[PDB]
Amino acid sequence: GAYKYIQEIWKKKQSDAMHFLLRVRTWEYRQLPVVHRVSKPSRPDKARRLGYKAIQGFVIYRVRVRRGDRKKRVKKGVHGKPKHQGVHKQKSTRNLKSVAEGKVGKSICGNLRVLNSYWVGQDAVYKYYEVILVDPNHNAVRNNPKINWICNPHKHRELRGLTSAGKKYRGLRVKGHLSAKSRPSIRANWKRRQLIKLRKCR
């Protein structure tokens, strides 16, 4: 139950020892580059309660991401109706956690695929997440009866929102009348809804 003990101690985040450990770890994270490799898990508890394994084809990357929103994109002073004048308070749709594995799965390591990410730490400005990536080419994962499904082509799950964060921010994580619309995906469901069908004999 050692992992249970670790979960219980990490569940606090505001014990004196936990606060100290978080401060020191975050400080030594900040001076490191924005995205890089960590040879061993920093939270084996959360990782292995997720789809992490101790086999040959597994990689853990630590990444940073700026807190705060993104603001609008227009040059200086925008052109449009009054309903869209404001720029500063505008918010995005993809969560910071999703953008985390986006920054790593986009181009810098195209050989790999994303599975999910966890907490690591936090700060005033630079948030921290450790994305997990799995090698789809080492013979171990191919021969494994499990997990090997990720070796069956569906790439760049982060760009299609197929991770846990993707399901969270696409409205898929809640069923029933609470969500309703987004179940077959938002655009597909809107197409089905407002689409009109006719028939040959009226």
Partner: protein
Amino acid sequence: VAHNNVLPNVHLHKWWQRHVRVNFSKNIKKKKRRLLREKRRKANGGTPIEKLHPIVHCPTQRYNFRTRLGKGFTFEELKGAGLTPRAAQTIGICYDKRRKNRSEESLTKNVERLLKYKNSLVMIPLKKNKAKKGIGGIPADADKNTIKEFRNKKPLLSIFKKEKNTKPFYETIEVSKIDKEFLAYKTLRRAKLAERRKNRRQQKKDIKFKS
């Protein structure tokens, strides 16, 4: 708008050429489905593709009086029939974990249907004349002669189909056995009026039983 017409209510104000799609292919799609299912059953050695389903009473007030076909039995009926679910899903029986039997009448009807179906199976040998006693409560493996004589007869599908319902809306009683004191309107209104207070009584019953 022009004088005495209904107020227009057309929901075409947005682009709809982009989304109009008529179905010319209804009949040919039907033919394709027919051919596909016919090939599927033909390739299956004569075993009927259809699967047995339970009979359940429909939800809500509007349909509180009809039976229909659900999705699978619960574990209690299978246990009464002597079938474990993981050996019953392989012979054309639907099982789940969501339904929980709540009425003894439906329990009895479902177990009767399942036992009738089980008695109606004629098992096919698995490994070319290595007939055995079977496990999990499946019926015993029949031998060469019985399967040889039955394979050329029509396989019944009435049990597969849903059941008809008996609605004897025409029935007669003796005039002497009529109790003429029953004020139905009084009964209904008194029941509706005494709704709230008896709820107080039931809630206090529950809170006393909580101890």
